Design a binder for this molecule. Structure first.
Ligand SMILES: Nc1ncnc2c1ncn2[C@@H]1O[C@H](COP(=O)(O)O)[C@@H](O)[C@H]1O
Ligand SMILES: Nc1ncnc2c1ncn2[C@@H]1O[C@H](COP(=O)(O)O)[C@@H](O)[C@H]1O
Ligand code: MOO
Ligand code: MOO
Ligand SMILES: [Mg+2]
Ligand SMILES: [Mg+2]
Lengths: 418, 418
């Protein structure tokens, strides 16, 4: 039985970034760049007005001048030179005509007469309200680098640079199955004796969908060694990168996941020192030519299943997808209520955390409430939980107001405020 | 010109939650529940073993006993009664046979002889390692409530309860267009004089895709009043809930977005006291029978466009989609470098924030680095920015180590660690 820190080190050392692919612009969203992106031309590519107003020769100063052209876009004012004693109308983003060296915003001007004459009311300075060529982005500047995750602003930079086919690291494809003679589909109505609905599979499909991976749903598998071997062989040869099973990893006489993974590939561990649970099998299997497939034999208890997904599977998905920082966000927070820690196993205690202007100590900070009873069979303990408090194995009661480390497991930008 | 707090109050007061719809299980992921969910049966629905081992009569105590049945699932052991002086083999999740009142885990037992006899090595207590009927979830208990956002554990609870068609609030459908005679498609190679690639549209499409809304891409629209009126009329009658335009809201003689929104609907504001920018038009339009459509005339400057999306459009999407807490997460943090605040406009200064074990004050906390020059034309200032620092309008230099409020704009659970 190994500590969680070692189990994750093992997973990190085995997990390899996937080969890069070329995708379209909107397919690149959420993916990690596998190439640097250089601007092919400057931004702006022409001297551009910051304001609606008039392009002037700054040394002319306040006075009445004829408006010799109008410049908003394209070839407007092409061939026209703004000479001393003349001005040109410009709109925001409009090309500055040759000869003009400053822009006077329309608020500092007045149109004179019934054609084309304007009164400049101020003394401007050379370069005022003009964006010189390349001031926002220089031609050939690197605007995005390999290993950078693509968000909305990064899509905007790719579009600025005219890139519509992008080299990225792909997301892994994940196969998911449930195991158990006691399971029935979640469409079941009245349950027969000794039956429960399969909840782990839909929960894991949803968890994987939140990680933006393609899912291969392999359904329910019974506690029969030959049947599970056939489904695992089919999953391995299908092209997936990760296989997630749940259940079939306890001490029962029909628990075949661990021995089948030991037969098909290399099992790095099968027991982890943590609460909730203990069994968690991690294996590397080679598909027949070929490629490597990672397998997690997740615990069957719903809580243990999702906690193991959050702690071990999420960073594996991120590493395969090329993230340079796959670790989850860890923060420090104060407990809103007392919590008893376990005397042997460090606990991943589910909590609902929020940021408060006063965390109890008179300074702003995160605070946490427990989701209640932490039994691994109680999926209600995961309900609304956006963090796992890392409780060391001391057996002591951590009083309300004490500080603990916590792993943030759900959208920190989707946190409900205090 | 109104303060941002008032502009958001106006948007909140006008924005209405969309009518609920019925979706399939996986379509419910990320959506807000529009009905409570009650468990139709208990979990477990039968007394279930916590361990692999033997179901016993606790008062029998240590001794050698015949194994009278094996119970793993379904009807295993149906009609069999465990009487004093007998035991039954059980696996985790297996139904406890009638008469047994405790489970002795296999580690506390030994199989005797070459048929079916076991030595119980301990004195157990009644109820040990048994999950009574309903201990995880009681029949008719409310497992999820209206207004709760559906994550992976909530999908798991829906599956537990046998719900595969769910009543939720839908996401709004968003139409997006760009405006400008200077724009060309982002597929353009060599740019002609006075042309830039349209970057706002792809950036906004990506931003809306991150909010999980369907996008209607209406393309580039020129600075022609009749053309923009036709596209806005077509967008309004198409069925969308929100229309996002960018550009065409400055002081130029061909900026038609504000007057067209004033003609088609009710403009609540067109100018906001904030840095970056100033113009931002918000309007409510009635589609011909019917329904309401919200329109944001976003600023054309790329930075101002995305900042206005993050501050005003994201909470509007969330309110329409039924979120009870649409406001973004705000935290308090320390500056890693000095920043000059503006003397008139409160600034939404872009930053890259991270959690540190020491934030500079000797206690853990968030810290922020500026993305550099904050000019609104400089989309590189949004690159990697996961927060907007809220700098009040004091004109003073905020030194490194000083505390400021910050809006978190990107996945807090996807934050790269220190
Ligand atoms: N797919 C599933 N959905 C809900 N509960 C499960 C699932 N698989 C296993 N379990 C339960 O988790 C516990 C451990 O299962 P196992 O790991 O197969 O021994 C037992 O109570 C099982 O009934
Ligand atoms: N879709 C767009 N992509 C990139 N820049 C834009 C876009 N629309 C407007 N701009 C620029 O933003 C500034 C303000 O534009 P406008 O709001 O139309 O006056 C000008 O420099 C425009 O060229
Ligand atoms: O895996 Mo546990 O024994 O419910 O903490
Ligand atoms: O909208 Mo600004 O004038 O670049 O701070
Ligand atoms: Mg099982
Ligand atoms: Mg324009």
């Amino acid at each position: 039985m190994i500590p969680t820190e070692e189990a994750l080190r093992i997973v990190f050392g085995v997990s390899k970034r996937l080969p890069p692919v070329i995708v379209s612009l909107y397919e690149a969203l959420g993916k990690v760049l596998a190439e640097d992106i250089r601007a092919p031309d400057p931004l702006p590519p022409y001297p551009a007005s910051v304001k609606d107003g008039y392009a002037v020769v700054a040394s002319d100063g306040p006075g009445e001048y004829p408006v010799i052209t109008e410049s908003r876009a394209g070839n407007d004012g092409l061939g026209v030179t703004v000479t001393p004693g003349t001005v040109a109308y410009v709109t925001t983003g409009g090309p500055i005509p040759d000869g003009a060296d400053a822009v006077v915003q329309v608020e500092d001007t007045k149109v004179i007469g019934d054609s084309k004459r304007v009164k400049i009311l101020i003394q401007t300075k050379k370069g005022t309200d003009i964006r010189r060529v390349g001031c926002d982005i220089e031609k050939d500047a690197t605007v995005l680098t390999t290993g950078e995750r693509i968000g909305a602003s990064e899509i905007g930079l790719l579009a600025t640079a005219g890139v519509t086919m992008v080299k990225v690291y792909p997301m892994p494809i994940v196969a998911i199955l449930s195991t158990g003679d006691e399971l029935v589909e979640p469409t079941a109505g009245t349950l027969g004796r000794g039956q429960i609905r399969d909840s782990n599979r839909a929960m894991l499909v949803a968890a994987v969908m939140q990680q933006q991976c393609k899912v291969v749903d392999l359904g329910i598998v019974r506690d029969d060694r030959k049947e599970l071997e056939k489904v695992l062989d089919e999953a391995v040869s299908s092209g997936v990168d990760i296989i997630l099973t749940s259940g079939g990893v306890s001490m029962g006489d029909r628990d075949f996941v661990k021995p089948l993974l030991e037969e098909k590939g290399k099992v790095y561990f099968s027991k982890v020192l943590m609460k909730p649970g203990k069994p968690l099998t991690f294996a590397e299997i080679r598909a027949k030519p070929g490629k490597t497939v990672l397998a997690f034999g997740l615990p069957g208890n719903p809580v243990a299943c999702l906690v193991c997904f959050n702690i071990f599977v999420v960073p594996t998905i991120r590493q395969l997808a090329g993230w340079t920082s796959p670790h989850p966000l860890r923060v420090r927070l104060r407990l809103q209520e007392p919590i008893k820690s376990d005397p042997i196993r460090p606990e991943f205690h589910r909590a609902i955390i929020k940021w408060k202007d006063n965390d109890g100590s008179g300074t702003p900070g995160f605070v946490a409430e427990s989701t209640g009873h932490q039994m691994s069979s109680r999926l209600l303990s995961m309900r609304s939980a956006n963090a796992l408090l890392e409780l060391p194995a001391t057996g002591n009661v951590l009083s309300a107001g004490s500080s603990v480390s916590a792993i943030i497991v759900s959208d920190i930008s989707a946190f409900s405020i205090d």
